[PDB]
Design a protein around this nucleic acid. Structure first.
Ligand SMILES: C[S@@+](CC[C@H](N)C(=O)[O-])C[C@H]1O[C@@H](n2cnc3c(N)ncnc32)[C@H](O)[C@@H]1O
Ligand code: SF4
Ligand SMILES: [Mg+2]
Lengths: 414, 126, 164
RNA sequence: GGACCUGGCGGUGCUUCAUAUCCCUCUAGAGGAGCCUGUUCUGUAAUCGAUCACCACCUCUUGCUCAGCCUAUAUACCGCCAUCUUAACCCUGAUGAAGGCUACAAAGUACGUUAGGUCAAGGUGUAGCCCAUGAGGUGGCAAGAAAUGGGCUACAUUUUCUACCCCAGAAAACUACGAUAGCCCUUAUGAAACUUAAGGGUCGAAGGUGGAUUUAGC
């Protein structure tokens, strides 16, 4: 509990209260509506000029819904447990107490239900175009929010090396140039699908197979470089680890990315239970280092969004996601601004900068007459459902909560 | 064990779709309210909804197929299709009960026309 | 020292604007391990001044740069690899001097400082030439450099410069 | 190691063409005004937010009634929607992998899922504050500018007014055309009309045909 009525008070460092209004209190991390660069927008529209009819709207909606509702691959352990349970249940039933071979077939038939069919998506040129038109803006917005976290809290950071695993459309590269464009000199992009590499190159050349790149220093690769010697300043993986077919692949990929991380490792996934579980698996992997004597001996910690390194309090049943609003790319079906729901985790080398860490709001703040509802993940490792009022917590605390929003930090001490 | 190893009867009413109501199906409720110039359509609809809920709750698991609610004058005829699972004495008890209760709730001479079938009369498998 | 990745074959094809693997008309050593073997066979280059020729993608360039050379002079004839070599130069500040021109015609006697010129009778004068060039141009160069040794001019104004 | 079989080539190029959408052509509009929207930036102690809400100040107190609260929770169920998953026979090759057609015919025939939304209480619960998430009062708060995204009137002569419903008379580019622009007043409906709608008067603004692109069509 980071909020005890009457005890906890605002942390006034740099005199923000006296020298600044409350809407610009340090814990504000809200990003305005995200608009894509004109270059990327024109390139995407030019590349989809060939075929942007009614079929494309249906395909985009279907693909987006399929990606959003897709579950993690079911490992053999849970399938074995389910099979044993259903086998016992069928043995109990006199009608279904058939022979073993017949029984096993019925259990398999019922397991075809109550389980998710995970299928690898083979992204060809057509499916690459559909995924582009369906997720370019959303990925850009999510990655922009993730990077804005780092800047807003650490504006002295001037990266020179970026790597992107599962770089499908170049969204991470575009955001990184839009943000740290004056210090980055190389953009390593990795993708097993050749069609996406071609599409990203074409987009970077203004939607034309021949042109001059908007962003200099981009490298495109199909295989993940595996070597601890080459260490990047920032490593990013956006909506990529969910494509891997098994937990072992996620384990090895996350270990490699952490080994090749210099300052920051950013993981971004859909804001569902599956993505949250995947990101917590990656978090527990990185935090609980198992390498006996790695080349880089620096420790790691969670820079965002968690104010602690304990197991997540929401991983039992619930999730933890954030929202970023953005202006969708102009199309025959994109009119109104949208909201992207995504889960994120940033792991940084070294140790926490100070001990005055602040709670994170993990849910929309609800404003009501003379009180505010905030769901706060405390640095002690617990959630707190807080109703802030001026009389109980103080005028400054109440006003700071009044101006705060989803994904902000509440500046409290003791 | 591992993933690649792994990798409904309907009655005539149920089988046909809503775009066949005047082509293959008919209307379960039949009354003059919806005709041009006639009034009290909403009252008839509310009465119909209550009738269906009550009849399904007073004959649980007995109704094989949907009710047919007919209206002639102030008469109210509930032509129902039920099963032969319940005892006939209980059927007679419930028939008298429902007739009297609905007659006194709607202030009209209600009447009930059970038709028992051995089992659900399936048309297709969807 | 953090260096950019070695270009792959596909990047080379796109850089040469060939769009195919059949009009390459060149052979590239894109294994840093063999290049490190070569530079190992070139001797001990610590605090040495190297004059490299025919870098191309730059595997030999990277291998020499990992060794603690004092300054590495590159002569490249293609403008299309100068961007990659400039990125390498940015990665290693002050140890890479890229020059556009022919290796048959470049004048090395002015390239390095005059304090390295050691007498002929002494040991090799702390300057080294390393080269993985096309076989159609490596023979005129060795003939020319043999003539220079006979006259003790050109790259051998510094003394008995070793070649690899 | 020799010979052979099925292949796959997520294959690579060329000649022909059906080559429909999309091009081009044709026509029709629109794109430049004056209404709105959504965003951003700037600025506010505060919200250009639907009496209520917000900001700055104060007051009340066991009170209304063992009070009171349009508070949270469907991330409690239920339900209403929405997302995703759910062959046989007969011949040939020595009875090898394997293969099987000729028409004036030569073996071929047959329910679960969801940090989903929706209590702008469909219902049943669960928690919150209860000298303040309750009840009052006094002031203030009724922002400013671009942009880009798109639903919105005419620019006049094949025009406008009158008669008429197609054989008429006038006016015509500065007393020309045009406003669903502004202001005032009447009527309608309602307890209530700056609120909403309609009519009359006032007014007679831009507009002078708008390129790239670009919107439609059989
Ligand atoms: C669908 S994209 C996700 C969006 C993308 N990260 C972005 O920035 O918008 C993920 C990509 O990762 C690539 N990928 C999946 N598994 C991989 C693997 N094992 N090795 C290399 N790339 C892989 C796929 O080709 C896929 O295109
Ligand atoms: S901030 Fe807290 S609730 Fe959210 S993901 Fe991190 S540990 Fe979990
Ligand atoms: Mg107001």
């Amino acid at each position: 509990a980071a909020l005890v009525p009457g005890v906890t008070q605002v942390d006034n460092k740099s005199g923000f209260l006296q020298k600044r209004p409350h809407r610009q209190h340090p814990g504000i991390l809200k990003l305005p509506h995200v608009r894509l660069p004109q270059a990327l927008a024109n390139g995407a529209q030019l590349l989809l000029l060939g075929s942007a009819g009614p079929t494309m709207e249906n395909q985009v909606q279907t693909l987006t819904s399929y990606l959003w509702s897709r579950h993690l691959p079911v490992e053999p352990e849970e399938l074995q447990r389910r099979a044993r349970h259903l086998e016992k249940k069928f043995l109990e039933n006199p009608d279904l107490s058939q022979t073993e071979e017949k029984l096993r077939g019925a259990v398999l038939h019922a397991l075809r239900k109550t389980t998710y069919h995970w299928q690898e998506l083979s992204y060809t040129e057509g499916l690459s175009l559909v995924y582009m038109a369906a997720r370019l803006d959303g990925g850009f917005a999510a990655v922009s929010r993730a990077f804005h976290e780092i800047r807003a809290r650490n504006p002295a950071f001037q990266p020179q090396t970026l790597m992107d695993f599962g770089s499908g459309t170049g969204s991470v590269t575009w955001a990184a140039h839009s943000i740290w464009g004056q210090s980055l000199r190389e953009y390593m992009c990795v993708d097993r699908s050749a069609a996406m590499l071609v599409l990203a190159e074409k987009l970077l050349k203004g939607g034309s197979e021949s042109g001059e790149p908007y962003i200099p220093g981009v490298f495109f690769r199909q295989f993940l470089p595996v070597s601890p010697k080459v260490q990047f300043d920032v490593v990013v993986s956006a909506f990529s680890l969910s494509e891997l077919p098994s937990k072992a692949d996620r384990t090895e990929v996350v270990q490699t990315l952490w080994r090749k991380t210099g300052h920051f490792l950013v993981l971004v996934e859909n804001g569902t239970k599956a993505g949250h579980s995947l990101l917590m698996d990656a978090r527990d992997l990185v935090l609980k280092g198992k390498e006996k004597s790695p080349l880089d001996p620096r420790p790691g910690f969670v820079f965002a969004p968690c104010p602690h390194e304990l197991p997540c309090p929401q991983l039992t049943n619930l999730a933890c996601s954030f929202s970023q609003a953005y202006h969708p790319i102009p199309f025959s079906w994109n009119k109104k601004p949208k909201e992207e729901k995504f889960s994120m985790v940033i792991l940084a080398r070294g140790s926490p900068e100070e001990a005055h860490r602040w709670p994170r709001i993990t849910q929309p703040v609800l404003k009501r007459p003379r009180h505010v509802h905030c769901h706060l993940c405390c640095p002690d490792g617990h959630m707190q459902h807080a109703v802030l009022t001026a009389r109980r917590h103080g005028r400054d605390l109440y006003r700071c909560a009044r101006v705060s929003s989803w994904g902000d930090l509440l500046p409290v001490l003791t | 064990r591992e993933l690649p190893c792994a990798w409904k009867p309907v009655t005539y009413e149920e089988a046909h779709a809503p775009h066949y109501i005047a082509h293959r199906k008919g209307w379960l409720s039949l009354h003059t309210g919806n005709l041009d110039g006639e009034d009290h359509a909403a009252e008839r609809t509310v009465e119909d909804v209550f009738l269906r809920k009550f009849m399904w709750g007073t004959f649980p698991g007995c109704l094989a197929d949907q009710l047919v609610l007919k209206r002639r004058g102030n008469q109210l005829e509930i032509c129902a299709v039920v099963l032969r699972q319940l005892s006939p004495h209980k059927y007679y008890f419930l028939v008298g009960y429902s007739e009297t209760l609905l007659s006194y709730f709607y202030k009209c001479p209600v009447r009930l026309h059970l038709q028992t079938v051995p089992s659900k009369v399936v048309y297709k498998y969807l | 020292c953090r260096l950019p990745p070695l270009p792959t074959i596909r990047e080379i094809i796109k850089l040469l604007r060939l769009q195919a693997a059949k009009q390459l008309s060149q052979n590239f050593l894109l294994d840093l391990r063999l290049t490190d073997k070569i530079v190992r066979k070139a001797g001990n280059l610590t605090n040495a001044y190297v004059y490299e020729v025919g870098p191309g993608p730059g595997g030999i360039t990277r291998s020499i740069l990992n060794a603690d050379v004092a300054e590495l002079l590159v002569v490249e004839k293609d403008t299309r690899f100068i961007p990659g070599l400039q990125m390498l130069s940015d990665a290693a500040p002050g140890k890479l001097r890229i020059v556009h021109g022919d290796v048959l015609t470049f004048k090395v006697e002015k390239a390095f400082s005059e304090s390295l010129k050691r007498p002929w009778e002494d040991d090799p004068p702390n300057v080294h030439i390393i080269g993985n060039l096309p076989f159609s141009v490596s023979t005129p160069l060795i003939i020319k450099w043999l003539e220079n040794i006979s006259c003790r001019d050109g790259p051998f104004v510094y003394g008995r410069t070793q070649m690899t």
